[PDB]
Amino acid sequence: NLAPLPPHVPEHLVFDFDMYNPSNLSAGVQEAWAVLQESNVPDLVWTRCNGGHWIATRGQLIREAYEDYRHFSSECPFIPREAGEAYDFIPTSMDPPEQRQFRALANQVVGMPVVDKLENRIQELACSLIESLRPQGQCNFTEDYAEPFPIRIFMLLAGLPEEDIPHLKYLTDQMTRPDGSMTFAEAKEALYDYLIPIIEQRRQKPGTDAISIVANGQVNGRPITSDEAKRMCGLLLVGGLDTVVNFLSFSMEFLAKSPEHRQELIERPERIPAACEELLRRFSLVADGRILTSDYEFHGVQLKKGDQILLPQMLSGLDERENACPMHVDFSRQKVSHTTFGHGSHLCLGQHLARREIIVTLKEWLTRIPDFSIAPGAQIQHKSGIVSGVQALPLVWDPATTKAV
Ligand code: HEM
Ligand SMILES: c1ccc(-c2ncc[nH]2)cc1
Structure with missing residues (x-):
């Protein structure tokens, strides 16, 4: 389902990539996207799927487009258009200077200082979930750890019931990796019916949870409105209920297959921080974009006002111009260049949180x-969208080789 080519698009710039169902899926998701960086592909392409949009394919252009908020606006950051249009999350659907006051607030709730405080719980939950898995010699890493781990730390942060997990998890999934089951606006609305009451309650009777802090915060010397809080909190939820979960499975899937990688981490634990960045580069997973605010000529191509462009965070560090031998995982690379957490004014607030969850899991599991x-006979399936994922991750091990702590 290709849309008829708009007038301004040079036909030699057409490259029909489906962000939701790329061609090489079976070989892996990052591998599927990397086709855009083969020699036959121009640097800035036009795809006809998902209603027609541009895709920047190189580190350099992605960074540039991300830096340039004047031309490339966060107003409509999701593809297809109907989805970018219904997108109203804060601070994500706003541009500087407006964006800045809301980011300052969200930062309060997820910043370094909050992670610093939650550390022992992180470490505590990891050790617990692991040790419980250990003697079984088998799990579904995706369901048994990847989901629980990050989700429960978030539930804790937010002060929300673990019971709510499944519902919230399905609505998140429809936003990022649409099933067909629900339009973006419907998913968005349902997350919202969920939050509203909770926000009301916390405006009235504040706790110390992230939601109460967002709900009663100040933005530009005045109190945040209800709609504003609803819209920040909605982002906080989806924000992490989805990204960490999938990142862990990609990393774990690689570790399960590379004995020498695991060993390296076991013998030289000083290397975990470095390995973490390398995994972030190699298993990078987000893809969103921007809307053109006007006619603008970028790297020689004519962008018409209103065009959407996909600026895949995933692709910068997979780009050979940026990283030599990009598909190879090397824990000792001199410079791990990626834009996994984004670039420009919207660089991820939750990065500190995610790195802490990653390092703990690796140190804790390997131990x-x-x-x-x-x-044996497991076929791992990746899925593509705004946030790519792993469907299930069947792991096996000999208990006799484990070590209880
Ligand atoms: C592996 C994990 C994660 C990855 C790969 C990731 C990726 C991203 C990316 C690429 C962006 C920028 C999107 C854009 O410029 O439109 C972003 C923004 C954001 N992320 Fe993270 N994220 C991760 C974890 C988290 C966590 C754990 C949280 C906390 C709930 C979170 C909350 C946010 C927020 C609040 C923003 C918006 C910042 C702003 O608009 O100024 N993310 N993330
Ligand atoms: C990075 C990753 C995901 C998101 C997002 N917004 C709504 C659903 N998911 C935004 C930023």
């Missing part, structure tokens, strides 16, 4: 279960 592999 207890140093030797594990993918289950």
Whole structure:
């Protein structure tokens, strides 16, 4: 389902990539997207799927487009258009200077200082979930750890019931990796019916949870409105209920397959921080974009006002011009260049939180279960969209090789 080519698009710039169902999916999701960086592909392409939009394919252009908020606006950041249009999350659907006051607030709730405080719980939950898995010699890493781990730390942060997990998880999934089951606006609305009451309650009777802090915060010397809070909190939820979860499975899937990688981390733990960045580069997973606010000529191509462009965060560090041998995982690379957490004014607030959850999981898992592999006859399926993921991750191990702590 290709849309008829708009007049301004040079036909030699057409490259029909489906962000929602790329061609090489079976070989892996990052591998599927990297086709855009082969030699036959121009740097800035036009795709006809998903209603027609541009895709920047190079580190350099993505960074530039991200830096340039004047031309490339966060007003409509999701593709297809109907979705970018219904998108009203804060601070994500706003441009500087307006964006800045809301970011300052969200930062309060997820910043370094909050992570610093939640550390022992992170570490505590990891050790617990692991040790519980250990003696089984088998899990579904996706369902058994990848989801619980990050989700429960978030529920805790927000002060929301663990019971709510499934519902929230399905609505998040429809936003990022649309099923067909629900339009973006419907998913958005339902997350919203969920939050409203909770926000009301916390305006009235404040706690110390992230929601109460957002609900009663100040933006530009005045109190935030209800709609504003609803809209920040909605982002906070989806923000992490989805990204960390998928990142862990990609990383774990790689670890299950690379014995020498695990060993390296076991013998030289000083290297975990470095390995973490390398995994962030190699298993990068987000893809969103921007809307053109006017006619503008970028890298020789004519962008008409209203055009949407996909600026894949995923692709910058997979770009050979940026990283030599990009598909190879090397924990000792001199410079790990990525834009996994984004670029420009919208750089991820939650990065500190995500790195802490990543490092803990790796140190913690390797300690207890140093030797594990993918289950025999398991076929791992990746999925694509705004946030790419792993469907399920069957792992097997010999209990006798574990170590209880
Ligand atoms: C592996 C994990 C994560 C990845 C890969 C990631 C990726 C991203 C990216 C690429 C952006 C920028 C999007 C744009 O410029 O439109 C972003 C923004 C954001 N992320 Fe993260 N994220 C991760 C984890 C989290 C966590 C754990 C949270 C906390 C709930 C979160 C909250 C946010 C927020 C609040 C913003 C918006 C910042 C602003 O608009 O100024 N993310 N993230
Ligand atoms: C980075 C990753 C995901 C999001 C997002 N917004 C709504 C659903 N998911 C935004 C930024």
